């Protein structure tokens, strides 16, 4: 009974930034989802396309555990049909998304008196991200018709902005850690199941 690596994805010292969001493929294991609902510690827990209860009796080709960090009042944007700074230039979710969104408050870890600027997000981009698309470009956002040649001034803006996480911030300003599970059903081996593990 290979136990899927959810201890490594959720309980993880360092998380990525949202524009540069982590991904962790999951295959060839038995996925105990019971811990993830029975927890009750997470502030956001909603799945799309499938009821969570009937997931132990389910099998999939691969699970994709995207894991990143955003400020409190941005978790609403991790959902189908959502818009805003994060959902368009950092991490977009498709309309037909089939998976779960899980997030918990991490101000006791990702903040620091003075401000933990370690985490970033994307301010400007040529256009919106396609679903599940990543953008790690540090190209200086040309905000005029005059090119910037790789340094910022007027009409030139380093597109990555920071997060001033302080433990006194408002909740809508405090850091949260989001884990976006994506479920995959290909005409394929389907090598990940939950508790009902009588087939191998």
């Amino acid at each position, epitope marked *: 009974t290979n136990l899927c690596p959810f201890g490594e994805v959720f309980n993880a010292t360092r998380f990525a930034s949202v524009y540069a969001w982590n991904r962790k493929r999951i295959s060839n294991c038995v996925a105990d989802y019971s811990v993830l*609902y*029975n*927890s*009750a*510690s*997470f*502030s*956001t*827990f*909603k799945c799309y396309g499938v*009821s*969570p*209860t009937k997931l132990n009796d389910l099998c999939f080709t691969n699970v994709y555990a995207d894991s990143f960090v955003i400020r409190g009042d941005e*978790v*609403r944007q991790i*959902a189908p*049909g*959502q818009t805003g700074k994060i959902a368009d230039y950092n991490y977009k979710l498709p309309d037909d998304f089939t998976g779960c969104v899980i997030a918990w*408050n991490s101000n006791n870890l990702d903040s620091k008196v003075g401000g933990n600027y370690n985490y970033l997000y994307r301010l400007f981009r040529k256009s919106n991200l396609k679903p599940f698309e990543r953008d790690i470009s540090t190209e200086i956002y040309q905000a005029g018709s005059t090119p910037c040649n790789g340094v910022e001034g007027f009409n030139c803006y380093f597109p990555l902005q920071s997060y001033g996480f302080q433990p006194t911030n408002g909740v809508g300003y405090q850091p949260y850690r989001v884990v976006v599970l994506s479920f995959e059903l290909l005409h394929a081996p389907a090598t990940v199941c939950g508790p009902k593990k009588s087939t191998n």
Partner: antibody, heavy 119, light 112 residues
Framework: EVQLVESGGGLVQPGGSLRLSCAASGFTFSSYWMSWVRQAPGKGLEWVANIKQDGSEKYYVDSVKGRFTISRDNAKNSLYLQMNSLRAEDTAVYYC????????????WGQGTMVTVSS | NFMLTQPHSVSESPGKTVTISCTGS????????VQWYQQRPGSAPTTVIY?????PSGVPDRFSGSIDSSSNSASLTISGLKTEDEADYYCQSYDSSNLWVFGGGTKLTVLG
């Protein structure tokens, strides 16, 4: 076929004790969380307590925290609510419900038992 | 301090469509699942809608849950009303600080 049957309600003057008990049937009791939801007559619904499906974690409302103790015997398919140091506001109908993970979906509702606290 | 607040009473004709709102007070509705419970007088509550828009087996097509991303609010909607639907309707969700919060309830009166 799911059914829940609450017992052990009635009248008790303030500051007294009383023990509720709700009998499960027709489902795997060891596989659900169990909650008590009360409803003062003519008023709305209020959640009271929830207990994990081994009996490890227990949660309550601040109104009853310290005075109400929730428990369960998975073998005997029964949920309990030890209500001690009662008040007048505790007067309500006390339902027992299946919820099922922890996040909602209070699936089934028993018919309830009356609890009157009057001096 | 995350209250759910819904109006006191709504009403409509024998056939009509009617919509009961449920707006969060401090915290995001659609940060967690939103249920809807029907309760006729003296009876125990029953679940008409679970997991945001979803209805249990046995509940007619007329009931339909939804979640407004704008107003921070969910809404129950009953297309093609029936006098049997006259009841009180409570919305309910969960929040990590105030566990298992409930709405005020709303009396849906089918105008006879």
């Amino acid at each position: 076929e799911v059914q829940l049957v609450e017992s052990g309600g009635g009248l008790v003057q303030p500051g007294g004790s009383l023990r509720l008990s709700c009998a499960a049937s027709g489902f795997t009791f060891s596989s659900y969380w169990m909650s008590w939801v009360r409803q003062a007559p003519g008023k709305g619904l209020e959640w009271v307590a929830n207990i994990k499906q081994d009996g490890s974690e227990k949660y309550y409302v601040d109104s009853v925290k310290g005075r109400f103790t929730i428990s369960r015997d998975n073998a005997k398919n029964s949920l309990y609510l030890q209500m001690n140091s009662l008040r007048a506001e505790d007067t309500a109908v006390y339902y027992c419900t299946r919820a099922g993970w922890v996040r909602g979906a209070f699936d089934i509702w028993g018919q309830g038992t009356m609890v009157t606290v009057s001096s | 301090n995350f209250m759910l607040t819904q109006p006191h009473s709504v009403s409509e004709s024998p056939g009509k469509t009617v919509t009961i709102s449920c707006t969060g007070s401090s915290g995001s509705i659609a940060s967690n699942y939103v249920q809807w419970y029907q309760q006729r007088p003296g009876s125990a509550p029953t679940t008409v809608i679970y997991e945001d828009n979803q209805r249990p087996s046995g509940v007619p097509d007329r009931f339909s849950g939804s979640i407004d991303s704008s107003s921070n609010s969910a809404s129950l909607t009953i297309s093609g009303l029936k006098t049997e639907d006259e009841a009180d309707y409570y919305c309910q969700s969960y929040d990590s600080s105030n566990l298992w919060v409930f709405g005020g309830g709303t009396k849906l009166t089918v105008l006879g």
